[PDB]
Amino acid sequence: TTIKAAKKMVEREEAVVWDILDEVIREHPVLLNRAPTLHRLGIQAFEPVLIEGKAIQLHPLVCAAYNADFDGDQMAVHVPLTLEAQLEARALMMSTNNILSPANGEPIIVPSQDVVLGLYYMTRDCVNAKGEGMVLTGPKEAERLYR
Amino acid sequence: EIKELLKLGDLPTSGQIRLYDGRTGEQFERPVTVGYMYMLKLNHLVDDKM
Amino acid sequence: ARVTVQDAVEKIGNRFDLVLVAARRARQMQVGGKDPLVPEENDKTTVIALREIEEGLINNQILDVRERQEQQEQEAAEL
Amino acid sequence: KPLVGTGMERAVAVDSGVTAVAKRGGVVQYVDASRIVIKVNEDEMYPGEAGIDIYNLTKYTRSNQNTCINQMPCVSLGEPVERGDVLADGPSTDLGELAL
Amino acid sequence: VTEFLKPRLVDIEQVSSTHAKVTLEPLERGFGHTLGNALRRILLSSMPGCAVTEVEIDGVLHEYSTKEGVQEDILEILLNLKGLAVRVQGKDEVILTLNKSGIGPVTAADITHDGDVEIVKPQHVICHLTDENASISMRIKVQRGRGYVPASTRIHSEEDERPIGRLLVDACYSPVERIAYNVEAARVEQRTDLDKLVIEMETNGTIDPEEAIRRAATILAEQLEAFVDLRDVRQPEVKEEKPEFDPILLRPVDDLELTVRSANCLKAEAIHYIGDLVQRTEVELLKTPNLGKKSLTEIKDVLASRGLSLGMRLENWPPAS
Amino acid sequence: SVTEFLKPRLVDIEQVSSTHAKVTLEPLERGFGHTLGNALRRILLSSMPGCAVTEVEIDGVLHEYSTKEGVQEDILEILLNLKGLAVRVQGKDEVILTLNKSGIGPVTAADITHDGDVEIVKPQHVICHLTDENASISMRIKVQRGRGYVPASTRIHSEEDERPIGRLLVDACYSPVERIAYNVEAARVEQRTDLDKLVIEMETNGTIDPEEAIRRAATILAEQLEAFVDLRDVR
Ligand SMILES: [Mg+2]
Missing domain, CATH: 2.170.120.12 (DNA-directed RNA polymerase, insert domain)
Structure with missing residues (x-):
């Protein structure tokens, strides 16, 4: 009820308050920010999910837009703190609402090296392999045969 | 010299040992290389950055 | 959990007035204490505001006429 | 110990005085986690006020970068040691070798 | 505590009545991976x-x-x-x-x-x-x-x-057309993240997807029956057969953690066993010279931490020495 | 026949040393080899008494x-x-x-x-x-x-x-176990083929018993399996 008891319960970090923290971040996005900001995408909006470690997990498909390699880059997080600001961050600066670069209509969300290497290896057809020149009736059959 | 040193031990000369996945429990094709590399821990700990 | 709002940009002229009417609706709903008209999923006010904007039952003109009729009926009940 | 060394890891380990070096060769007299007592060879012994050598291993202490520097003994009882030999490897050292 | 956890499913979607999506939560830190892998390798190959x-x-x-x-x-x-x-x-x-x-x-x-x-x-x-x-x-x-x-x-x-x-x-x-297991993070009330299993499957319609899951589970249980603890708890039977006194009495007097001088003057009196010292009073301890305030108090306090009393009456001695 | 096949069984507890041991299970019909091997290895490395x-x-x-x-x-x-x-x-x-x-x-x-x-x-x-x-x-x-x-x-x-x-x-x-390796090979049967015999070698601390550890792992796996062996729309 009172503020003092609430602060005491929060600083004590009981196991019950975790659901409150989970609900309060369910639809409350935050703003990720890279230290050097040169274009629009230097600050973006993201829905946070609670994890361990004092490190901030980031989606791999957006770091290329952030120009933030994983060699030890430090980034900041801000909170809208206002219903209007929350709605704005969800509307305009949302990650899904920013895929075309502000400079060119080309997608800034272009895949990085790992995924394209995996796909290139997956689709690079050889001349002789297990199941050479057989016939199938569906992609699910192919998944079963592969796994 | 490295080739002959690997030949001295039971390790393969190619320096690429096959690996088995821990989760799926199957074999990785394209036998990857494995070794023992010296690594250093930098003085940029997360406990001093957060 | 709202991931795509492109159909909302298709509904309203742009995003400025869109987020403006969304903010007005969320103010009238959450800190306004009124009732919504869309089934929720145990969430906040922002995403249900975006949902009811996406449907089409709430927009700028509908909000205007609703608040106008509410003011008129309140003045009538005041006599 | 770094497996793939460059040979220099020995010299760089003894040049910097971070580790305990033997000023005078002799035989190990008393080993402890902090104090190392070495009996001096009578040949290398000083003419007057003859005696022994006592090294005080720098224990856990704050360095200039808030890093714990410490020296551990690396010799057994009665282990013969010569002049300039290592006696206690300090931080990031092992058997007289730079091991970061 | 040798006591693992059990999942409590909350989402069983049966869209199209032949393409099902089941969840399982929570699991251990690695049980989701092995469970999904086993279920996949069973439904794909070993499923009559x-x-x-x-x-x-x-x-x-x-x-x-x-x-x-x-x-x-x-x-x-x-x-x-x-x-x-x-x-x-x-x-x-x-x-x-x-x-x-x-x-x-x-x-x-x-x-x-x-x-x-x-x-x-x-x-x-x-x-x-x-x-x-x-x-x-x-x-x-x-x-x-x-x-x-x-x-x-x-x-x-x-x-x-x-x-x-x-x-x-x-x-x-195999009656299943396709299978896909996935792992996600689960939030226990105090634990931060555990494995949450998500199994998507689609079958030819011969049997229900959940029926196929139950059949794979039953066949895996039939395979593992030969090694499952032989029973539910492997020992629903308890008994007890212990000697009257404790083997500490047979242990030497040096197992008392006393000073070297006290131990020496105790061994000099042919007292090399705790059972030979518990069955006597200290009226003869002070008779032996060099048995002062240190040795006597140490001996009488070590046994105090052991509960036994200095001076007892037992006839079963010495078994078996 | 093709359905309702057999079950494996412990046939060896040979300890090559005090710590390093090696057990063998047999027989396995087909495909169950790698499955059971990976499963038991993951359960053993995950947690043991x-x-x-x-x-x-x-x-x-x-x-x-x-x-x-x-x-x-x-x-x-x-x-x-x-x-x-x-x-x-x-x-x-x-x-x-x-x-x-x-x-x-x-x-x-x-x-x-x-x-x-x-x-x-x-x-x-x-x-x-x-x-x-x-x-x-x-x-x-x-x-x-x-x-x-x-x-x-x-x-x-x-x-x-x-x-x-x-x-x-x-x-x-x-952790009693330190490393758990496994493999499969041909099995023995009076009249059949493609039967698989599994072999698990384990380098452990020597505290726990190989058969006891295998049985505890099998019990944990059977419990986790019975958790949904008859799963329904339960809450
Ligand atoms: Mg960088």
């Missing part, structure tokens, strides 16, 4: 079911040939047969006749009403037929196997002999 | 970041060596052992005052080097049976148990 095995055409002996009356090639008919989901009773192998011609496209319902078997989807089209004088038929033969069977293992069957029956078509004995 | 040390209590030293006149190694390496050893308890789950020694020499685990239930799997493991003569080491060693692994700092529940200075905490990384 039933499917088509053999095809019989009139005179087309070669896959590199065609037959008028259809707007496709024999490979298309084989691909369509590869999906003919039909279940059989206790019979190990049964043939079915498709002696039918006409105009409209031939579907799965054209097979004779063999009461011993039953087709899953009778409306499944077998082959789009030519709309004029399309006089062509075939025969099928279904069995029950272990899992996916390629044509290679049947090439040996082709190598054995060649009657009219020797044709070639794969057999997807 | 361990009985390592949790905390110690040395009377001479106060905090683990100090020295002790008479011993050669540092208290931190004493804690690491105490973590390295392994014990086996049968009656109770937690027990406080005592390590007391004097005189110059390599003090190993055999110098502790063992009990009837607690047993040392290997006494050759050196603990410390009592270099000085008038140096008497005396400490308590708490060992409680656990499941899996727990760090040192996160194991706290209050702030009163750590008030005694002598209570030095170490990460109870209790």
